[PDB]
């Protein structure tokens, strides 16, 4: 792809994080802690899943960033509306304000409703995410496989400002402790 020149510097918003997440000093990495991280509750925190938002809000333009997923077994990545539900159970779908892909149980899927099987021959260690606000597009790229296309959501109805979206996944297996990392420009 040729989207690299739209690179934006994303940082994580601590205030939105589930209370078990540990975000690095530079706000560029996040991992699952083994316990509650001793923060106060607030209405912004995702309560039921290991989720966090980027601090940046987008309402126009073209934006690109990259995320390192090395050695993870499960995660979700993409964008979401600023006003998505934070508390309780919900599915990741465009109807609920999410444009995402995930890894789960050795396969990759797009967060449509119902979900869509992805076709990935080279498991990615880094993911590229491209948003074209005006066009209504969210696309995902396999950086490990020379930038090959993973998935495009088109005809998106964002209906609000967008924020970068992350889920580090649970670590029931003991094999999913590795962080998500925002990769340098
Ligand atoms: C916030 S929540 O959705 O976890 C919830 N709070 C009360 C009941 N449930 C449902 C539940 C518990 S185990 C799986 N689903």
Curated annotation (Swiss-Prot):
It comes from Mus musculus. Residues 8-185 form the B30.2/SPRY domain. Belongs to the TRIM/RBCC family. It comes from the Eukaryota. E3 ubiquitin-protein ligase whose activity is dependent on E2 enzymes, UBE2D1, UBE2D2, UBE2E1 and UBE2E2. Forms a ubiquitin ligase complex in cooperation with the E2 UBE2D2 that is used not only for the ubiquitination of USP4 and IKBKB but also for its self-ubiquitination. Component of cullin-RING-based SCF (SKP1-CUL1-F-box protein) E3 ubiquitin-protein ligase complexes such as SCF(SKP2)-like complexes. A TRIM21-containing SCF(SKP2)-like complex is shown to mediate ubiquitination of CDKN1B ('Thr-187' phosphorylated-form), thereby promoting its degradation by the proteasome. The coiled-coil is necessary for the cytoplasmic localization. The RING-type zinc finger is necessary for ubiquitination and for the IRF3-driven interferon beta promoter activity. Interacts with SKP2 and CUL1 in a RING finger-independent manner. The RING-type zinc finger is necessary for ubiquitination of NMI. Induction: Up-regulated by IFN. Autoubiquitinated; does not lead to its proteasomal degradation. Deubiquitinated by USP4; leading to its stabilization. Autoubiquitinated. Homotrimer. Component of a SCF(SKP2)-like complex containing CUL1, SKP1, TRIM21 and SKP2. Interacts with CALR, CUL1, FBXW11, HSPA5, IKBKB, IRF3, SKP1 and VCP. Interacts with SKP2; the interaction with SKP2 does not depend on an intact F-box domain. Interacts (via N-terminus and C-terminus) with DCP2 (via N-terminus and C-terminus). Interacts (via C-terminus) with IRF8 (via C-terminus). Interacts with ULK1, BECN1 and with ATG8 family members, including GABARAP, GABARAPL1, GABARAPL2 and MAP1LC3C/LC3C. Interacts with TRIM21 and SQSTM1/sequestosome 1. Interacts with IRF3. It is found in: Cytoplasm; Cytoplasmic vesicle, Autophagosome; Nucleus; Cytoplasm, P-body. The chain holds residues 291 to 468 of 470 of the full protein. This is E3 ubiquitin-protein ligase TRIM21.
């Amino acid at each position: 792809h040729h989207h690299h020149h739209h690179m934006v510097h994303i940082t994580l918003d601590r205030n939105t994080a589930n209370s078990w997440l540990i975000i690095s000093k530079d706000r560029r990495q996040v991992r699952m802690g083994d316990t509650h991280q001793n923060v106060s509750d607030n209405k912004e925190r995702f309560s039921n899943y290991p989720m966090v938002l980027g601090a940046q809000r987008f309402s126009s333009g073209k934006m690109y960033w990259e995320v390192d997923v090395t050695q993870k077994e499960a995660w979700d990545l993409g964008v979401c509306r600023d006003s998505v539900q934070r508390k309780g159970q919900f599915s990741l779908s465009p109807e609920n304000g999410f444009w995402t892909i995930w890894l789960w149980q050795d396969s990759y899927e797009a967060g449509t409703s119902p979900q869509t099987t992805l076709h990935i021959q080279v498991p990615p260690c880094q993911i590229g995410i491209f948003v074209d606000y005006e066009a209504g597009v969210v696309s995902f790229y396999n950086i490990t496989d020379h930038g090959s296309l993973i998935y495009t959501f088109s005809e998106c109805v964002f209906a609000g400002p967008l924020r970068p979206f992350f889920n580090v996944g649970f670590n029931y297996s003991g094999g999913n402790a590795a962080p998500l990392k925002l990769c340098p420009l």
